[PDB]
Amino acid sequence: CDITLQEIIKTLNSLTEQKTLCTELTVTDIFAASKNTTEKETFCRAATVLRQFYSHHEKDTRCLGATAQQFHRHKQLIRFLKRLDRNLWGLAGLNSCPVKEANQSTLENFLERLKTIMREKYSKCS
Amino acid sequence: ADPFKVLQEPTCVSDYMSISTCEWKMNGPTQCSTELRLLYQLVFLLSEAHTCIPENNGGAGCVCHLLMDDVVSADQYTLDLWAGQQLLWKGSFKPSEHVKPRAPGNLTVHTQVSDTLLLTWSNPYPPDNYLYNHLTYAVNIWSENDPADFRIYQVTYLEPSLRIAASTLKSGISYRARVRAWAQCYNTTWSEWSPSTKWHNS
Amino acid sequence: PLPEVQCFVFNVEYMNCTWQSSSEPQPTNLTLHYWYKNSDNDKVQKCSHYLFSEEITSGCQLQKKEIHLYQTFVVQLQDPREPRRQATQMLKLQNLVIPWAPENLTLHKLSESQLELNWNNRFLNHCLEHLVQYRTDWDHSWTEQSVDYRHKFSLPSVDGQKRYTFRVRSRFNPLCGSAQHWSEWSHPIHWGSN
Numbered sequence: 442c443d444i445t446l447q448e449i450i451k452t453l454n455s456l457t458e459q460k461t462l463c464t465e466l467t468v469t470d471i472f473a474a475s476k477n478t479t480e481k482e483t484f485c486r487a488a489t490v491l492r493q494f495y496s497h498h499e500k501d502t503r504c505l506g507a508t509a510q511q512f513h514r515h516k517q518l519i520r521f522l523k524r525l526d527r528n529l530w531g532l533a534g535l536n537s538c539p540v541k542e543a544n545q546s547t548l549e550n551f552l553e554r555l556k557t558i559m560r561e562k563y564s565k566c567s
Numbered sequence: 568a569d570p571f572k573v574l575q576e577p578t579c580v581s582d583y584m585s586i587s588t589c590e591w592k593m594n595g596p597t598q599c600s601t602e603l604r605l606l607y608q609l610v611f612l613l614s615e616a617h618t619c620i621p622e623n624n625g626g627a628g629c630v631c632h633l634l635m636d637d638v639v640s641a642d643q644y645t646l647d648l649w650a651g652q653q654l655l656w657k658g659s660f661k662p663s664e665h666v667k668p669r670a671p672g673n674l675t676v677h678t679q680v681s682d683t684l685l686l687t688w689s690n691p692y693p694p695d696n697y698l699y700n701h702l703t704y705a706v707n708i709w710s711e712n713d714p715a716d717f718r719i720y721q722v723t724y725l726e727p728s729l730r731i732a733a734s735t736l737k738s739g740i741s742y743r744a745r746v747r748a749w750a751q752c753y754n755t756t757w758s759e760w761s762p763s764t765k766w767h768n769s
Numbered sequence: 770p771l772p773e774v775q776c777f778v779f780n781v782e783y784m785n786c787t788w789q790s791s792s793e794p795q796p797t798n799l800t801l802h803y804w805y806k807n808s809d810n811d812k813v814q815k816c817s818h819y820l821f822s823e824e825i826t827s828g829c830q831l832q833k834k835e836i837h838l839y840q841t842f843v844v845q846l847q848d849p850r851e852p853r854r855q856a857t858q859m860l861k862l863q864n865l866v867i868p869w870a871p872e873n874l875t876l877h878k879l880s881e882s883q884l885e886l887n888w889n890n891r892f893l894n895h896c897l898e899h900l901v902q903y904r905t906d907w908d909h910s911w912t913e914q915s916v917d918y919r920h921k922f923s924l925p926s927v928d929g930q931k932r933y934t935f936r937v938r939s940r941f942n943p944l945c946g947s948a949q950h951w952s953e954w955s956h957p958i959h960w961g962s963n
């Protein structure tokens with residue numbers, strides 16, 4: 442494992458540190474339905490889920506609080522999600538990976554779960 | 568047919584933060600800023616293209632600073648150098664494979680204790696940046712009147728500090744210092760030297 | 770209510786889960802049951818090797834085959850004298866690792882004043898983080914610098930008229946897991962004289 446997987450982890454550690462106003466919103470849980478898909482499909486799928494999220498919530502009123510601080514936290518949340526998306530996507534190398542599922546999840550648990558999947562992946566290679 | 572020509576493959580580096588600088592050489596005297604346009608675009612779905620206006624670097628040399636919102640290892644860019652309607656050159660560039668770190672700053676000298684001399688500086692990157700925790704340094708210390716005798720200390724730990732035993736510093740004179748940085752994890756080159764700092768120790 | 774279990778994975782070789790026995794209104798043997806959540810192999814397990822302190826159940830001990838980091842871990846502290854008096858608990862083992870102290874520290878010259886310290890670890894090269902510590906026989910306190918997983922420190926300025934001593938410890942953080950605790954300091958090592 443080279444730097445790509447490492448960046449993904451740091452960003453995750455960073456994101457799981459403090460939760461923001463919109464970390465409660467839900468997203469498709471793609472882990473609770475692991476249908477023995479490839480390692481790639483997962484990365485790609487996770488990228489898709491996150492992409493949809495920042496895509497839909499970037500300019501969300503609820504998320505941008507009432508204080509500058511809530512505002513910056515949200516901007517940053519969005520920033521990091523983009524970093525995750527592009528790295529995870531680069532890692533998979535798939536043009537498309539349909540996320541057909543219905544098991545919802547809180548982004549907070551999604552990131553927390555994903556962080557574990559990534560740290561384990563890292564602990565493997567040497 | 569092709570009045571304007573790029574002599575050699577253009578070369579770029581990134582500070583891995585906001586900027587990427589490409590350098591290249593033209594076949595003759597050229598007004599870069601007037602004749603050329605470099606269009607870069609991230610290779611990622613639904614991403615727009617950007618236009619950079621080249622600065623001049625010597626009579627037939629050009630340089631251009633591509634501004635980026637963020638940078639991650641996966642990211643790759645398309646580059647298209649135009650001279651009007653004539654594509655001069657086309658290429659790809661992956662920031663994470665050609666990193667040159669920003670020079671460190673705020674080099675200050677501490678002389679409270681007598682045994683050792685303490686040197687501190689600042690790490691140019693924000694803590695949230697992927698390079699922050701990967702930099703190690705090199706401090707350069709020389710005498711003003713006796714530049715001949717200069718030393719280069721290698722700081723191979725994360726803290727931006729250096730301690731040198733004063734038992735190696737001819738008192739009475741004034742020395743100058745400056746520091747640069749690199750990140751082994753990304754196989755980067757050295758940063759530029761930081762502004763220097765002279766001090767007269769006793 | 771009963772004591773709280775405190776598991777700690779050692780160098781990812783074996784885990785130790787203990788509790789203070791002097792908190793019970795009477796002597797007893799609390800049983801330990803463990804299982805992993807929402808993964809393969811959900812079935813509950815019995816502590817296959819109990820630990821004893823003052824002729825009482827001190828804790829449990831599981832071997833490598835039984836340790837699964839990156840998989841929600843769930844311990845159960847039961848009391849035979851009460852089938853309904855117990856507490857269930859879930860852990861993230863990955864954050865409870867504690868590597869062995871680094872060993873085989875070396876000290877050689879790479880140049881005229883480049884003094885490089887080296888050392889090796891126990892099967893977790895890229896998961897470790899290190900804290901190097903040094904001083905002279907005159908210093909009243911150590912000075913510490915952190916490598917990340919480098920295991921290669923280097924003092925850029927060495928004084929010949931001084932005896933140096935070095936030591937390091939490792940930590941399983943932050944890429945493979947967020948373990949708070951360091952390992953025990955490695956045996957010291959010396960250089961030069963005076």
Ligand SMILES: *[C@@H]1O[C@H](CO[C@@H]2O[C@@H](C)[C@@H](O)[C@@H](O)[C@@H]2O)[C@@H](O[C@@H]2O[C@H](CO)[C@@H](O)[C@H](O)[C@H]2NC(C)=O)[C@H](O)[C@H]1NC(C)=O
Nearest residue numbers: 578579580663664665666667750751752753754755756757
């Ligand atoms: C790290 O980079 C070096 C140097 O490559 C070039 O120099 C950089 C500073 C940059 O300016 C670019 O022009 C180039 O990328 C790489 O050098 C090679 O090292 C390998 C051994 O690892 C050796 O087999 C090759 O002969 C070297 N190539 C050349 C042209 O000399 C080096 O590979 C990079 N190190 C790692 C860890 O990837």
Ligand SMILES: *[C@@H]1O[C@H](CO)[C@@H](O[C@@H]2O[C@H](CO)[C@@H](O)[C@H](O)[C@H]2NC(C)=O)[C@H](O)[C@H]1NC(C)=O
Nearest residue numbers: 670671672673674688689690691692693694761
């Ligand atoms: C020199 O040091 C000062 C610290 O006083 C730096 O200024 C701070 O920079 C950080 C990160 O860029 C900001 O978050 C702070 O708000 C700035 N001011 C504060 C509160 O200190 C400055 O960037 C340093 N310069 C160099 C060369 O790194």
Ligand SMILES: *[C@@H]1O[C@H](CO)[C@@H](O)[C@H](O)[C@H]1NC(C)=O
Nearest residue numbers: 779784785786820821827830
């Ligand atoms: C695990 O328990 C045994 C027996 O009590 C003890 O000797 C050992 O040191 C413990 N593990 C640790 C703390 O490394």
Ligand SMILES: *[C@@H]1O[C@H](CO)[C@@H](O)[C@H](O)[C@H]1NC(C)=O
Nearest residue numbers: 796797798799821824825826
């Ligand atoms: C507990 O177990 C120990 C060791 O098996 C045994 O000596 C003792 O009789 C048991 N009963 C209690 C509650 O002490």
Ligand SMILES: *[C@@H]1O[C@H](CO)[C@@H](O)[C@H](O)[C@H]1NC(C)=O
Nearest residue numbers: 872873874888889890891892
């Ligand atoms: C040095 O330490 C290693 C542990 O990685 C050990 O296996 C080795 O035997 C030690 N060196 C010797 C030969 O004493």
